[PDB]
Symmetry: C6
Subunit: 72 residues, 6 copies
């Protein structure tokens, strides 16, 4: 079909978001963030860990590892 | 459906700007900037801390953490 | 064709279920099989664990078997 | 409609006012000088006699040594 | 002609089968011959081992013989 | 004095035509040295004696000419 350049990334993020799965978000400098994905757009992800919000730039992420299996 | 590619990033930055909330801006090299968001555009953010202005390139940011909760 | 090599490499590793090492800019080495990929990301699987990898963080991908691309 | 409004105003004001700046790089190096020119991807810094072409992709922050009226 | 130099350099090294050193942003040095390339990746071969290299991770490519570009 | 467009192109082309030695500093602290033989949108070809080096611009932090450039 047509070009869908975000099909995997969008499905992964939306599934983690909708299922409220805790994720580890690893950054290029080795820092590991932890929380749930509250929202995301083209270039950013909003992580929530308790009462703390963190806006994460995707360009700084190496990997996202869910703490439960996602049925993507 | 509809997706807006900047809605999260713009709402986060604009709410912190309008509410004058102090933020920590973490950089790829581990440096942590602190201040208030005075302005922003597609690729840069203008931080203010006391009398000092800093132009930050978004490509160097890993995360932004607000010091108060943002109602987004 | 801007993606002819990259797409052929990733798809062959995916279809043949070949283990790969994915080396990152910071020296971390991931290991697993490529389950899926799109323009900017690759889904790795290692046993039960899934990992979404951003291509911008990858330096090299090394297959554990020879790929007939 | 104005994706560069802040970046251009900041760089152009520093350039026109000949304000000394610190340009911090991703690897921690701190350049110093005045902005002589800039384009989409680069900034030309002058520190006395020496010219340096800086790639914006390597910059983390620019800190002016005097307040910029922007 | 945004790729005139890059394409000529990579194609000449590929066609002449010249060994190259590919230096990465983190200081790792890969070695091999360029088997193929596209817009964003290079396929390096060192004997039996294939490595897909993302160009965004490369700092420099140094050929081990002079290329008549 | 201001090239809000074409600064990079003018700088690189002036160093190339004048055969000025440059230091090319990389993101990881490595300093390359040579003359710019050619360049395109994303790469620069450095020459240092008999050795050619293709440099990706995305890895460069700064380029410092060893003589003043009249851009
Ligand atoms: Cl898509």
């Amino acid at each position: 079909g047509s070009h869908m350049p975000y099909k995997l990334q969008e499905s992964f993020l939306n599934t983690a978001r909708k299922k409220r799965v805790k994720v580890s978000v690893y950054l290029v400098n080795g820092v590991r963030l932890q929380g749930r994905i509250r929202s995301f757009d083209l270039f950013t992800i909003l992580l929530e860990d308790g009462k703390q919000q963190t806006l994460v730039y995707k360009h700084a992420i190496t990997t996202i590892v869910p703490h439960e299996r996602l049925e993507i």
